[model samples]
Target: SNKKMINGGTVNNWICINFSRQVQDNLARTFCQELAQMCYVSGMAFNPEPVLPPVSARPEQVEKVLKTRYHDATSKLSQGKEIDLLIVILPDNNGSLYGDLKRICETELGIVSQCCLTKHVFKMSKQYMANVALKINVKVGGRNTVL
Candidate 1:
C-alpha cells in the first residue's frame, strides 16, 4: 500500500522512506560485521513515524516534536530493553546549503538536555539540494527493556 503524503510534518514521506532505508542498511551491515568478529555490540533499530504537522508544529514544531517523540519513545522502550544510542534523521531547507549550515551551528545546537547532551549534526549538500542529519544519543539512565 502506498502511503499518501500528509502536510504539516517535519519530514516528507518519500524522504523519510529513503532515509530510513539507508539507515537500516547501515545498521544491519555494522551489526553483522561486529557479530562476525566476536565483538559484543548492542543491537540497534530504527522506527520512523510520520508525525502529522502538530497543530502547533511551525518553526518550533520540528524542534518540539523531535525532542518529545525522541524522549517519549526512548523512555517507553527503555522500560524493558537497553538502548545505548538514538540516531535522529531530519531534512532541513532544500535550496540553501549555507542557510542550513548556519541554522544548524547556531540555533539547533542551542538545544540542551542531559540525555541528549552529546550530539552530532551532519549535512549532505549537492547542487540545489541538501539534507540535515541530526544524530542524538539517548541516555539509558540505567533503565532496561526486554525487547
Candidate 2:
C-alpha cells in the first residue's frame, strides 16, 4: 500500500434500513448524507442519492425488514440493478442481531453492508465518519491505503 488515497470505488445504488429505536428516520437520513460525503471526499465514487429513504424498524424484525425493504428498494430500479451497499444502523448492545445480519446479507443475499452503532449517529463526528468511509472503500473494491 502506497500511503495514498486512491482508486475510488463507485457505489451507485444503495439503501438504509435502520434498526435503532434511538435513531429516527430523519436523523439517520442526515447520517447517511454525512457518510456519502465522507466517502466521496476520501476518494470513493460514492453517489449522494440513495435507492430509498432510510426505513426505521425494530430489531425483532431484523430478517423480515432486511429482506422486505431490500426487495422494495431494488424493485423500484431497473431490472438487475442491485444495491451496491447497504447501511444498517444497529442499536448498541444489539446482542446477536449483528451476527445474524452479517450472515443474512453476505451469506444469503449476496450483499455488502456497513453497520454503524446508534451512538455514533447520535453524536456524529468526522473521525468516525472517515473510518466508516475507509471501511466502505475496501468493501466496495476501493483502496484507501498506506504504504
Candidate 3:
C-alpha cells in the first residue's frame, strides 16, 4: 500500500528529452504523464505536464541540446522562475551520454536530472515509476517516511 508522504517536495518547472532510438515521442509523453501522476500520488506537488513535450535528440547532442532546452524553458517560464528538474530517456546501451548528462546537469546547469532507460520506458512498470517518484521527491528535497 503506497501512501503519500506528509512532508513532500514540489516541482514547478521541468522539461524532458528522449535520446533513445527505441522510445517514440508518444511513449515519451505517456511516461512523463504517468511519472507526474505518481509524484502526485506520493504527495509531491509536481506539475502534471512538462514545460514542453519531450525533445528528440542524439546522444552526442547532449550538451547543446540541454543548453538550448534549459534556455528555452527559462524563456517560457515567468521571470524569477527556474527549471526544477529534467527527465531524460536514454538508450539501453550508451557511452559517455549518461555521464555527460549527469555532469552537465550538475556542474553547468545546477539542476537535478532523472534518467530512464529505453527498456524501462517501454515496459511502463509501476514499481519503476513509483521508485522514480521517490527519487524525484528526494531530489526536490522531500522527507521520506522510514516505514
* Predicted structure with the largest TM-score when compared to the true one: 3
Candidate 3 local lDDT, residue 96: 90
Query: What TM-score does each of the candidates earn?
Result: 0.24, 0.93, 0.94
Candidate 1 regions exceeding 4 Å error are 1-59, 78-83, 92-147
After best superposition, candidate 1 residue 125: deviation in angstroms? 15
Cα error, candidate 3, residue 144 (Å)? 1.0
Residue-level lDDT of model 1, residues 12-106, one tens digit each, is 11011111212344443332232222211122232232222112122334445445544454455435532233223323332342344235434
Clashing pairs in 2: 1-147, 3-146, 3-147
Q: Tens digits of per-residue lDDT for model 2 on 19-136? A: 9888888999999999999988888888898988999987888889989988898898889788899999998889999999999999888889999999998888988998888888
**Model 3 regions more than 4 Å off:** 1-6
Order by TM-score, highest first: 3, 2, 1
| lDDT agreement with native, every candidate | 0.26, 0.88, 0.90
Q: What's the residue-level lDDT of 79 in candidate 2?
A: 93
